[PDB]
């Protein structure tokens, strides 16, 4: 009945190809799902997990997905194993867990000296992220010492000059400036499930629309889809345009005009009027704000919409 909880296991293959922040898309992801008694044991689940996915218990390790105060979600460490599952999840239901597995047993992890770090390589030429797996590293390890593993996993020649960032959270990608300090010195509040994003330091990057990973994540963070509806066409479903929240009036107008194969001066836009259907007040072309300022009367979930008419 309500004595049961759902436990959701995510595997590393789901981290592959992810273009967003964190390890995967919380809104779109494959899980192996388990119905488990809230008062069942960890050791029970582990055996039941072992039997089910064809892996001996020595070759698997559970890293519960943990929500952070800043809104991100990351694998966290989990000796303990006789507490109930609902206590370990701290009353989260469902509870999502990253399942690390070996591949031709797992290396030991010292809860006090190591950290599990995830790696992403950014390619400015194609403007894409490439998941480079995870590593066990001693906290006392210098940043410089991590470079060969990064070069190795990205397919770069050894001693390739790299630029390194910490992906802290959406719109916060912090460049690591001194490669010769320990990891805990480089990364404030160093934790398991932290992410280092790195890229080749080549002059050819600056021809890219998005030359660094910081730029990439900034663009992604401000990206917004807006429905545009023709005021003079009743019950128009409208069309979707991908914009940026930091666009000014002119950039919106021009983008919508290229969508409609027309001139931006032949387009009159109207504000949202919110929950009411239909156009609100006219938008003037000397508007001094950003697209974000125009859509701030919308919640993050509420579908963004604007009205237009051809002149």
């Amino acid at each position: 009945a309500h004595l049961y909880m759902q436990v959701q296991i995510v595997a590393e293959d789901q981290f592959c190809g992810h273009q967003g922040n964190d390890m995967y898309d919380e809104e779109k992801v494959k899980y192996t799902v388990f119905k488990v008694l809230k008062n069942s044991s960890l050791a029970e689940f582990v055996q039941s997990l072992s039997q089910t996915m064809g892996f001996p218990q020595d070759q698997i390790r559970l890293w519960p997905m943990q929500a952070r105060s800043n809104g991100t979600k990351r694998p966290a460490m989990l000796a303990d194993g006789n507490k109930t599952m609902i206590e370990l999840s701290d009353n989260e239901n469902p509870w999502t867990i990253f399942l690390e597995t070996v591949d031709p047993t797992l290396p030991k992890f010292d809860k006090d000296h190591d950290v599990m770090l995830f790696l992403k390589m950014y390619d400015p030429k194609t403007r894409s992220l490439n998941y480079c797996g995870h590593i066990y590293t001693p906290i006392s390890c210098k940043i410089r010492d991590l470079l060969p593993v990064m070069c190795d996993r990205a397919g770069f020649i050894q001693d390739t000059s790299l630029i390194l960032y910490e992906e802290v959270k959406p719109n916060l990608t912090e460049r690591i400036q001194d490669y010769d300090v320990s990891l805990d010195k480089a990364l404030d509040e160093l934790m398991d499930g932290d992410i280092i994003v790195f890229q080749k330091d080549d002059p050819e990057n600056d021809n890219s629309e998005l030359p660094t990973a910081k730029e990439y994540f900034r663009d992604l963070y401000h990206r917004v889809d807006v429905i545009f509806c023709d005021k003079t066409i009743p019950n128009d479903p409208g069309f979707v345009v991908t914009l940026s929240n930091r666009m000014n009036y002119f950039q919106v107008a021009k983008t919508v005009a290229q969508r409609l194969n027309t001139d931006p001066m032949l387009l009159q836009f109207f504000k949202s009027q919110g929950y009411r259907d239909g156009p609100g007040n006219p938008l003037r072309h000397n508007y001094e704000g950003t697209l974000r300022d125009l859509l701030q009367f919308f919640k993050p979930r509420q579908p963004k919409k604007l009205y237009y008419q051809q002149l």
Partner: peptide, 13 residues
């Protein structure tokens, strides 16, 4: 002077 933090600690329920 004191640290404001980056919110990487665990979210309250």
């Amino acid at each position: 002077s004191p640290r404001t933090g980056k919110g990487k600690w665990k979210r309250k329920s």
